[PDB]
Scaffold this active site. Structure first.
Site, PDB file in Angstrom:
ATOM      1  N   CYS A   1      -2.701  11.519  -8.174  1.00 24.01           N
ATOM      2  CA  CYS A   1      -2.725  10.115  -8.553  1.00 24.01           C
ATOM      3  C   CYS A   1      -3.580   9.272  -7.598  1.00 24.01           C
ATOM      4  O   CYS A   1      -3.672   9.571  -6.404  1.00 24.01           O
ATOM      5  CB  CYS A   1      -1.279   9.600  -8.594  1.00 24.01           C
TER       6      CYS A   1
ATOM      7  N   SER B   1      -3.017   6.579  -6.181  1.00 21.70           N
ATOM      8  CA  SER B   1      -2.234   6.084  -5.056  1.00 21.70           C
ATOM      9  C   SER B   1      -2.311   7.036  -3.868  1.00 21.70           C
ATOM     10  O   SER B   1      -2.358   6.586  -2.723  1.00 21.70           O
ATOM     11  CB  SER B   1      -0.780   5.864  -5.463  1.00 21.70           C
TER      12      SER B   1
ATOM     13  N   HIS C   1      -5.367   6.429  -2.093  1.00 23.42           N
ATOM     14  CA  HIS C   1      -5.306   5.178  -1.340  1.00 23.42           C
ATOM     15  C   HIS C   1      -4.770   5.459   0.057  1.00 23.42           C
ATOM     16  O   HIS C   1      -5.109   4.761   1.013  1.00 23.42           O
ATOM     17  CB  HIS C   1      -4.440   4.147  -2.065  1.00 23.42           C
TER      18      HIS C   1
ATOM     19  N   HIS D   1       3.285  12.295  -4.898  1.00 23.91           N
ATOM     20  CA  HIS D   1       4.513  11.668  -5.364  1.00 23.91           C
ATOM     21  C   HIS D   1       4.759  11.912  -6.856  1.00 23.91           C
ATOM     22  O   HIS D   1       5.749  11.433  -7.411  1.00 23.91           O
ATOM     23  CB  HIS D   1       4.451  10.158  -5.093  1.00 23.91           C
TER      24      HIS D   1
ATOM     25  N   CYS E   1       5.153   9.917 -12.451  1.00 22.58           N
ATOM     26  CA  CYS E   1       4.411   8.714 -12.120  1.00 22.58           C
ATOM     27  C   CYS E   1       3.557   8.155 -13.226  1.00 22.58           C
ATOM     28  O   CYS E   1       3.945   7.184 -13.863  1.00 22.58           O
ATOM     29  CB  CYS E   1       3.537   8.902 -10.876  1.00 22.58           C
TER      30      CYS E   1
HETATM   31 ZN   LIG Z   1       1.200   7.344  -8.657  1.00 24.85          ZN
END
Ligand SMILES: [Zn+2]
Ligand SMILES: NC(=O)c1ccc[n+]([C@@H]2O[C@H](COP(=O)([O-])OP(=O)(O)OC[C@H]3O[C@@H](n4cnc5c(N)ncnc54)[C@H](O)[C@@H]3O)[C@@H](O)[C@H]2O)c1
Ligand SMILES: NC(=O)c1ccc[n+]([C@@H]2O[C@H](COP(=O)([O-])OP(=O)(O)OC[C@H]3O[C@@H](n4cnc5c(N)ncnc54)[C@H](O)[C@@H]3O)[C@@H](O)[C@H]2O)c1
Ligand SMILES: [Zn+2]
Ligand SMILES: [Zn+2]
Ligand SMILES: [Zn+2]
Lengths: 374, 374
Positions: free
Chosen positions: B46, B48, B51, B67, B174
């Site tokens: 993902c 994220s 990031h 995650h 997610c």
């Molecule tokens: Zn995510």
């Protein structure tokens, strides 16, 4: 004796921007099809009317302002079925045609037939019923309540209890309903909840009353002017906080006070910075913040979308989210049934002819609400 | 043979910012009280997680990211009652302790026990179960799925159907749930409604699927990359619009297309300008706009509150507004009951060891979703 013909009366005419209201003798033409001529009994002085004066709220001039009022129907045009001569009524600055997508939508009330978005300053048919010395005068939000008589389209008037005090229930035309509704209709305040109200003027107090009626456990009034606190507490506020008393930012103080953030926050000032503060102070995961006011001379607020990603809800509304024609009569009924008091909001009462003086009281801020009587 | 003792396995360790993932041999300590050690089966890559790499999402380093995943419980610590060894599970990056104000609130899901707001990079007890060469490694969002084995707190894991394909249902961890939920839980899309989805990546497609499941009459996909259109239409989009094809602003085009504004709009890109555009394109009186994404390197958007005063609703959410533990099992059940397809979202499948390659595909944008298999 009056129906079907022109009426000669006085009205407060605004000829140019940043000019005082001129009490002029005007001619109010008879109501055409689906129109209603009303003899004014009382009309409130709202900040929005002042925005017309300062040129902030752009609408065609010359004009007869005023949108918060109550009166008696003197006559009706052909096709009118909702009201009758003699009926006590309240003009609706936000119409309810009942036909457009918005009126048919369970969550919408901003009738597409409104004259707020792109002001024409006329009746729904594009013409005016007002003339001063043979010169046409524009209408305002399909109401124009600053006149002894006005003509409004049927979708912009609601019949109310025949025994209601027009000097008081006129507030239902704007101020009260806007605040009350923001709490009861827009935010949908729940019992035992914690609320934060920014700005304790007339509309701010009305929001408090709504939170109280909704069963809020805590209603925190917020205002930089301490003189507004007593009234706030009188109407429902459990606590009053002044941002000037603190060294730390107000949203921080409110977050700590409510142990994590308030359930519902309302911005009733129309300031870009407090709107963001109001949003930020509600709980991050389920907090709801309501925009109840914004200045017509539109400027952009600055905000971090992160405040929203956590789960907050940001929303605004006109006329407290109430579908005007359906709501006004029921609100008057509630007032008549003693469900709430309107007197705490009325701080000044002046005869219609002293309209300019009423605006001085509004501009100075020493007035919560001035009501003009005819 | 494995329970109660340290497990030696491989994991993708991020030692410093802007550095590639390092496949390291690590020691995963046994689960303490109310903890769960999980053998990973599949984990998605993902944005994220990326990031974290670029230092955008600030969390303690070194760390084991990831995650979005699914796996099999290898063992449980004392007190664990929700899962058992052998159970197929999905780690919850957004916990559900069920005790805090948020968990007890009918509209909240952002559990106060989260490690997103103020990242500690540890288990709920403040310590880590990861060590590399005797050196402690931080956890990530109470999940750390980029490891052959992970230990998570019980409030951060959900038991799912024992017969579900973990290589597919891991998206429920997610991506899918975030998009799907934004449409089905946050916006609460109604039948026959018109929706606008900005950004047609994995989460964007999931939003479309939600609008389709909700019975939306029109689902307008919006993206500057035409290559994303086919998949969008395949999953539910009725129309696809590219802002680069037009001369006039996109909100204007969308307003005209929906004859006044869409019912529901979703921003699934994380761009300040499109968030405002997404809000502006929904109907003024009852339009709802949902923020589904925002970049961790928080910058402020500029917007006029007038957009909200008319009646619009602006809201965001994490994990599609779903209370994690309660929702995940039901979402898997729906997938198992054929209620929706996850395959259209999976564009690449690579073995866990080629994690860096999966990130190259993510960063290049040629991948909708890369799933890492163990
Ligand atoms: Zn995510
Ligand atoms: N939504 C609608 O349909 C609707 C209807 C009527 C009025 N309004 C808006 O609401 C306003 C009228 O409400 P009322 O009457 O007005 P008001 O001026 O009495 O209320 C403003 C109050 O906020 C306080 N205040 C000023 N700055 C503050 C700050 N920085 N922090 C905290 N408090 C501060 C002031 O002391 C003042 O008492 C108008 O601006 C109007 O635009 C909206
Ligand atoms: N809310 C949550 O809990 C949650 C969960 C997962 C991901 N996210 C967020 O969602 C994003 C991941 O979604 P996916 O995967 O990503 P993606 O990068 O595949 O989707 C972005 C798409 O938007 C398009 N786009 C770029 N600029 C555009 C523009 N200016 N106008 C219109 N379209 C434009 C791009 O072409 C791209 O296809 C991440 O940024 C992440 O921060 C949020
Ligand atoms: Zn007003
Ligand atoms: Zn209407
Ligand atoms: Zn919780």
């Amino acid at each position: 004796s009056t129906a079907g013909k022109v009426i000669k009366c006085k009205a407060a005419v605004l000829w140019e921007e940043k000019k005082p209201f001129s009490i002029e003798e005007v001619e109010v033409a008879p109501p055409k099809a689906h129109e209603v001529r009303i003899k004014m009994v009382a009309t409130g002085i709202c900040r929005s009317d002042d925005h017309v004066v300062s040129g902030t709220l752009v609408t065609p001039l010359p004009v007869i302002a005023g949108h918060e009022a109550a009166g008696i129907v003197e006559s009706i045009g052909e096709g009118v079925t909702t009201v009758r001569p003699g009926d006590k009524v309240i003009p609706l600055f936000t119409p309810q045609c009942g036909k457009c997508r918005v009126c048919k939508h369970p969550e919408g009330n901003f009738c597409l037939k409104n004259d707020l978005s792109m002001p024409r300053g006329t009746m729904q048919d594009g013409t005016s019923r007002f003339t001063c010395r043979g010169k046409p005068i524009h209408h305002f939000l399909g109401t124009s309540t600053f006149s002894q008589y006005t003509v409004v389209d049927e979708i912009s008037v609601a019949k109310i209890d025949a025994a209601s005090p027009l000097e008081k229930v006129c507030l239902i035309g704007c101020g009260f309903s806007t605040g009350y509704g923001s709490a009861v209709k827009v935010a949908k305040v729940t019992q035992g909840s914690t609320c934060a109200v920014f700005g304790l003027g007339g509309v701010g107090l009305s929001v408090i009353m709504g939170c109280k009626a909704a069963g809020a456990a805590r209603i925190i009034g917020v205002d930089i002017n301490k003189d507004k606190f007593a009234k706030a507490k009188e109407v429902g506020a459990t606590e009053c906080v002044n941002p000037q008393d603190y060294k730390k930012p107000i949203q921080e103080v409110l977050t700590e006070m409510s142990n994590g953030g308030v359930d519902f926050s309302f911005e009733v000032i129309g300031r870009l910075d407090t709107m963001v503060t109001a949003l930020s102070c509600c709980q991050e995961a389920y907090g709801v913040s309501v925009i109840v006011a914004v200045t017509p001379d539109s400027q952009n607020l600055s905000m971090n979308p992160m405040l929203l990603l956590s789960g907050r809800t940001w929303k605004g509304a006109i006329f407290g989210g109430f579908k005007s024609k359906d709501s006004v009569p029921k609100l008057v009924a509630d007032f008549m049934a003693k469900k709430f008091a309107l007197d705490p909001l009325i701080t000044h009462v002046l005869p219609f002819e002293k309209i300019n003086e009423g605006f001085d009281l509004l501009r100075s801020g020493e007035s919560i609400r001035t009501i003009l009587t005819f």
